[PDB]
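Researcher: Here's my situation. A collaborator sent me these components and asked whether they could plausibly form a single complex. I don't have experimental data yet, so a predicted model of the whole assembly would be a useful starting point for our discussion.
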Amino acid sequence: TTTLAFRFQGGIIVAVDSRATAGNWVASQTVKKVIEINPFLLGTMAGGAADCQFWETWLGSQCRLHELREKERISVAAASKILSNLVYQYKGAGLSMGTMICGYTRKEGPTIYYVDSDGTRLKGDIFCVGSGQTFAYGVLDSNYKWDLSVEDALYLGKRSILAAAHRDAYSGGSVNLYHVTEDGWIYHGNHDVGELFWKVKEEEGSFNNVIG
Amino acid sequence: FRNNYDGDTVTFSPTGRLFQVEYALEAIKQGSVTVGLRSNTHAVLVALKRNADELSSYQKKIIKCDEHMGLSLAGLAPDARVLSNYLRQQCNYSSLVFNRKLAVERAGHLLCDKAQKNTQSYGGRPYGVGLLIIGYDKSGAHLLEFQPSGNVTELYGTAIGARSQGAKTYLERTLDTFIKIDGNPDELIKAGVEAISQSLRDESLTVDNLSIAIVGKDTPFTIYDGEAVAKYI
Amino acid sequence: GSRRYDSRTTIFSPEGRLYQVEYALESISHAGTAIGIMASDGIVLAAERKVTSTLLEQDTSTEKLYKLNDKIAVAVAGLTADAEILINTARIHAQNYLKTYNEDIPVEILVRRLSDIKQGYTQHGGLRPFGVSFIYAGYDDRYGYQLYTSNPSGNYTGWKAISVGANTSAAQTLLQMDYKDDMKVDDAIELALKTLSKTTDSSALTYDRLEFATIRKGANDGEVYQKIFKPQEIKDILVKTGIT
Amino acid sequence: GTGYDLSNSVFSPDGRNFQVEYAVKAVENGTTSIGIKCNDGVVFAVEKLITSKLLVPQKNVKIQVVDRHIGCVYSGLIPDGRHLVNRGREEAASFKKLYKTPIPIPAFADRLGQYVQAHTLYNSVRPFGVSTIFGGVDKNGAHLYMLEPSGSYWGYKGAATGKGRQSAKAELEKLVDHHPEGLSAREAVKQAAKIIYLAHEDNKEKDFELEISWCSLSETNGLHKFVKGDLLQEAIDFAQKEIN
Amino acid sequence: DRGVSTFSPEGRLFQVEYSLEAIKLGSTAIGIATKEGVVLGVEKRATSPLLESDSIEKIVEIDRHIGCAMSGLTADARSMIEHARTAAVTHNLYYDEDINVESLTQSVCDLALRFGEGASGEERLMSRPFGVALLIAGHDADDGYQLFHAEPSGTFYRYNAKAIGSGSEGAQAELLNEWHSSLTLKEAELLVLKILKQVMEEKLDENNAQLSCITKQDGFKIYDNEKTAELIKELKEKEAAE
Amino acid sequence: GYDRALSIFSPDGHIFQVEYALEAVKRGTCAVGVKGKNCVVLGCERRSTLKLQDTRITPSKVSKIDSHVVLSFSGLNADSRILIEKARVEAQSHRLTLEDPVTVEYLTRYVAGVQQRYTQSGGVRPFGVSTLIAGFDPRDDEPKLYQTEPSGIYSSWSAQTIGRNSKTVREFLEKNYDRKEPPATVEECVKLTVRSLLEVVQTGAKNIEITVVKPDSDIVALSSEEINQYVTQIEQEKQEQ
Amino acid sequence: MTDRYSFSLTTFSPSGKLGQIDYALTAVKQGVTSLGIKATNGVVIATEKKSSSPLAMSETLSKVSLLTPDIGAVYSGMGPDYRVLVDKSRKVAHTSYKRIYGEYPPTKLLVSEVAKIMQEATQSGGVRPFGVSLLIAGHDEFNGFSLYQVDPSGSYFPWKATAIGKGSVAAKTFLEKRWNDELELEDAIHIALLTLKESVEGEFNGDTIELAIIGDENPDLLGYTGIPTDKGPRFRKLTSQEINDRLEAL
Amino acid sequence: MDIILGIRVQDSVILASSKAVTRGISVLKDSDDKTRQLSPHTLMSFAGEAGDTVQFAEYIQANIQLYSIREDYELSPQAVSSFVRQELAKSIRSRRPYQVNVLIGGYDKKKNKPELYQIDYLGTKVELPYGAHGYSGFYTFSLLDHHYRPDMTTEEGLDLLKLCVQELEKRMPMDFKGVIVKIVDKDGIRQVDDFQAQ
């Protein structure tokens, strides 16, 4: 798995792969690793499939309850702390999850929180999580500027996940892109690596090693 | 007198009575009439649904407990939900653990014991609802009458609720007839509708006012309401 | 069942009053008078021993003045047995505070806790309240010398001078008549004894019917000191103030 | 004063427990039931009033078995009776599990006894509204017992309770005097059917249904069983004949 | 005294009956169901002019397709709402679908009889019944628009139109006449506002009365004062029109 | 073990223990709160059944739940401590889980819930307390004022009073407070408050304590002098006529 | 079942009285007289053994009980309550003191524990107060000899001498006249026997009287030798014979 | 481990804490502030297990703030450190102990003196002129044992730290990404935003 989210001039970019494995067995290439908690909140998933997917769905429930109770949208900081505290109650039990809670609120602006089953909760501008994180960091880190155009940031992200899909045996399938602005997130498609790779190879001229 | 011995269910009156149980029994008499009768192949329930306004709905009187069992109520609706839900659990347990359909006679004993527990301990109140239970098990068709006192009885037919004495006399009169209505559900139901109408007064049974249920040989307990009961009015 | 014999010790009257609390106070009103007077350089506690005899061993007796801490003490008015229950928990509370923070417990903190306990028997549990009123005399570095009072309701307040028990009205009037913000411990000691003397239901105010205590910062040291006077010490001070 | 009959575990000035006595009223108001101890077993019989033609004949069985060798019949609040039998079954199961041997009738009796007596010790419970006749065959023969709402019980030669308890007792005493050598299980069954028919006069208004069960060393192998079919009809005829 | 779960000689539960009485003393509440949605209106009833009338919340959202109005000891409804919301959200979490309005109502009613000082049947810890009634309005794909009346008795009825509270007996009589199976949402709105106006001691304005509705398209919404003030004006005109 | 239902319905549909709880509030010293355009003020009266107390240590009537919210009350003093402690505890917890201090309406809803719960729980009596909670939500400048009572009901007010003679002081406020133009000044806001209390305090400079709350955790209680001054400038308003 | 009496059976009356405790006190007044006298070198506690049938063997019952080897108790009021109070008192001296410090508790503290037990029966749910007053006498290294009285309320006080029960008023007045801070134990014992004589109707001998003392250490009553620091119990019940001998010098 | 340093000079206590947050093979953040203010004149730094660290610091902050509100007073640094030691001492024998080490730097307004407390996850508390948790102590203790004086100024202290930080950046194995320095004195707590080149 490879997931990343970074903050920039045009808001936030969120990109994930879609591969699921059990040992060396590729269980699936069609997993939805991004959860649309709500029109303005996103959750990314890495680690144990059932763990992320179950607990983040639960998080969505807790978030909705908050709004019904307070007649107001839950903050990114508070949404991430609910998952953080839940997961901490289970410390030592073996939950496995590297997660990112990304959103927008008039009060906080573009925000990103990294939350893992270790109890670690961190706010940041850039985070890559999963067995493919380093591969994504390599591409993302060396082309990141706070001044990318929404269109360039979108590509950098997509390309970063592509990089991981290629080098990490445990990452792959397709890329799922999201852009987060104050009017919520905007889906930016599902890009199957089966065609995305060759397209990028030709157009960009990178991946010069692989012969085509 | 009575006022000194009816403050709870843990007190006997000087004559050996339990008033809290008796007051509970009253709630049933104030409830809408419901009839139950059976042949050797089917068991039927017919109930008069009461409504609040003409803007409100008619409260359901029949509850399914399992594919082969169900009942009709008279009295506190909530208590019926509690008791039927418990009957459902007992039916369920019999299947899951023994791969056995709960016999109607056993359901009756279980119900009796549950009701009883609420008439001998402090703090609890008796149930305020009567239940007629029909079902088809390994011994055929059955009809049970459940009273909040814990007394459960197997009969060929009966009726509870306001003006119930009417239908009861009629059934006690039709006995030799309806009990032989085997292999013809429609006839048994019509005998049931004739029995219930013997307890009418206020009005006449309409389509969104009548409720009928049947269970039998090759008939899973099924409820009929509205248009479904039209062919019987 | 049991409901038949339940007195319901925790309910409001149609006037919004707590019966048992009222009745408990009614009980306190017949208890030996206890007075607390706070001076600039110390505090004084004085109580009248209710019911006494020739045979009562006074040297070993204590029915109104109890040490809670090295800097806090209380005067009791009401059921002595009920007070001991509270007293002992107060002693534990002070040591818990010390163990936790490595600092002596601030006087108000001790008083609030004890008051909270009383309050509880007032809102839940169906048990009767403690028939006790306390006058707290203590010193800490945040508020210096302090004088508090708590009663069965669980409410507490601070005072410059105050009394609990019997003839409090008469006693309060006499105190509110001769108390002066710039009093000296010894002045307070005298005002205390004079008040008791005029409120006493007894013939004369003799030492054998009194318990005395002071919390003074013995200049020749720099630390505060608690002193629960002994029979002779009271007999002396009694002759001096002019009550022989 | 008065009011000694409003709460269960209360003693009246004359040492009585009225709530228990009131329970007895519910029992006397019930159907008549009996027990006859023969030379190698016991016979149980009861009156089943036919409130209406609507009751399916032979369907609402009153007599209950505990374990495999014990029979139970009672008069009064049926639901209370079932409740007591449920306790008996648990009681018998617990005994067998540990001691292996099915529970001896005498031990079973005291098990029911202590339980029923327990319901006269607190005001939070109500005494049992039934008198129960039970027994069976064990290592040392047959045993017949009757248990009252007070928890009282003794061994009997013959026993009756309910509406026609007097007719029955009269009849049972007759049998005792005319059979010092003992009655057989077969005879006890017929005689039981008669006693019930006779005692039915104190309720001759409603029609009834007879029910008999028996536990005999020679007739049922010590196991409790219902008397059905021909042996039953035969007993009914023997009664219907002597009723005229 | 007498057990909180005691039966009267007529077969009713004292506490429950007395509970209903407290409800009669409550602020008026009215609900009207139409094939276009359901309208829920309530009387604010401020006990003083200094009380900021918009802090009076007698109409609340259970879920996006379910809202409800309360009448009686309103503070008692807080735990009922929490329970209703939790049930609605939980059903979604476990079944990946919205909860049916009828079930949500049945769920709320199940708490009803959960009172007593030791009732043998489970663990009913609550010293007394609730002192508030509710009108639960919503929509679901199975039975469309629905209006329910839930009482502290544990029972609930479905109504085409229903009024609860102080002026209910009169308002219900009115509804018995005014209502018909073809009303439009707008028609139901004016009708609610009209009946409220009649029974309210105060001169109905956009500050002592509040309207809301639930439609399949936009879910449950509470009309803001500006929107309601205009509906009020629109009423006065049609009334004075004849 | 004790679980007797103490708060129950009577024939006419009333919960007498809750009602008698209000009677306890009626007997309590007066308390009032008025919200200006950029602040909120709380004033309480001091009894005089006994005077010789040490005002330094005697617990005050206005309590801080957090640094931006305060609570005052009327009724049983012992009972109020319990509500205040719980509220303070909840305030810290909310800061921990939501990573943001409580809003005045939230803190109010919590306190009110505690009171409601004590009206339908076995073995306990309702709180003989009505409160006034005021402050400024985090990063907000709009003043907040709420009131809660034994029943568990709460609501916001432009200005309100509870306690003895609260009937009187409310009248004063209803015909002396204009929502159109709320006391645009901290000073004129504190004046209206001291005026409303004088209607019932009957000359009590040492019997009147005021506390001012401004946006961003700015809370302070005036001293006898600052107050005595207001009293002074007001008795002249009368005489100068 | 299950004790549903979780509420207090002793509450305040409008007058401010706690009825149940007053009534308990009343029961104490009706009880047989018992008294205690402290000397300079000992303490003596005594009472009359009011046999309730000539067929009953009064020796099988003891109104004067040993709590610790240096502490004894006697009472007036309901004997069965006293009996269980003795069992609890002996146990608490262990569970709350000997098991902690490896030494028996000083007189005032054990009295304090007993007193607490009684106070609880005055406020806990479902119980009545104990219908007895106790007289506890003992000795401990840092406090010497002491004598205490414990009432049904849980209150206790130290005495030089006193009496409770039936003829306490008369007995107390008599003790006030004879007591002085110079009495030796034998003197106190003599005074005790004299005081008790007035309160006794019928027979007055070592078989109808029960008396014990807290005096010197009795190494002879230890049951073993070898440990210098263990010198023997200070508590000792006088024998019937020992009593009659003193009655001749009455 | 992370670097947690504390040094008490003449009239203040200075705490320095590494900014790196590394998980396995990746440094996730380089600006992490390993500190919680317990009260206006008391600051606590921490290091240890991934989740316990913050859960413990915040749990304590909540309690000290609660004490502050209730008593309308600020507990002395000595009192706070004692409360902290107690909590950790309970923890060590609990089901799942907090694996957290902390430095507590406060300014005692009553005594008018700065104080520094070192407390490990076992509940071991000691007051010192300077302290450290983790491996840092292996280089910084002898350093300060050499270059430290009681009467030093705050400015001197910051230079003393710069000296410690440099030694750590030279000899320590990991890249801790520099530190964040804070000063606690009579006027409260402030952060020296310019140490990345002071």
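Model: Some features of this prediction you could bring to your collaborator: Chains E and D do not touch (no CB pair under 8 Å). Chain E has six helices and ten strands.
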